[PDB]
Design a protein around this ligand. Sequence first.
Ligand SMILES: [Cl-]
Ligand SMILES: [Cl-]
Lengths: 122, 122
Amino acid sequence: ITLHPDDRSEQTAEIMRRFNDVFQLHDPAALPELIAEECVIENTVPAPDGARHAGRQACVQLWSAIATQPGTRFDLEETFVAGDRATIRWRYWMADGNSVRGVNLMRVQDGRIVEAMGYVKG
Amino acid sequence: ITLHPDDRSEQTAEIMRRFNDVFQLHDPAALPELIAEECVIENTVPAPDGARHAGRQACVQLWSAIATQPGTRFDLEETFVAGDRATIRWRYWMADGNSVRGVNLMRVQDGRIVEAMGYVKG
Ligand SMILES: [Cl-]
Ligand SMILES: [Cl-]
């Protein structure tokens, strides 16, 4: 985690560590405590806009499925934190052996993830 | 521009304003002075990795063409700055009338853009 010094930067880093570990450990147990009631994900697909998932339940369900899909994984390229925001660059490996690079733009409020926006190479 | 308070945040905001104006005004005159000799762009396409453009000349050429392509434009969604980094969310409108949302991750060093990473909805 690259930290830009800022009031809550260390808190946001801790949130991103635990968030990233869900995927690295394929273990979604931490997801609910990290996600705001009103959390929104703007997913990577489909263009033009990306789907939208709203509310803790939808966000937990989506990320849980992602974290536990057989034959898939993520390599973390860089997590950069500043204040209540972070960027997480990654490479996603698919069950067919292909991969794609992407990024999440993350925002926290009251110590929980309220916004996650995903993008990919197209 | 949303600024996260940090040493050079105001400088980075100024760089991003002038960078964004190149596209909004379809005027690439400012590009060279904003771009480091060694600047690298990791473009939005093609998956998996995105092409790579290296050096001021390549980066100026690519962005100049983008800025001046007839029938195309960008809407700025949000520019967020922290320290020597920024994120710029946008919607790109293509000559065929379609659009796609995307984001640039930007990094400056010595007052010039050294790194620009682009991603899109897929
Ligand atoms: Cl990678
Ligand atoms: Cl938009």
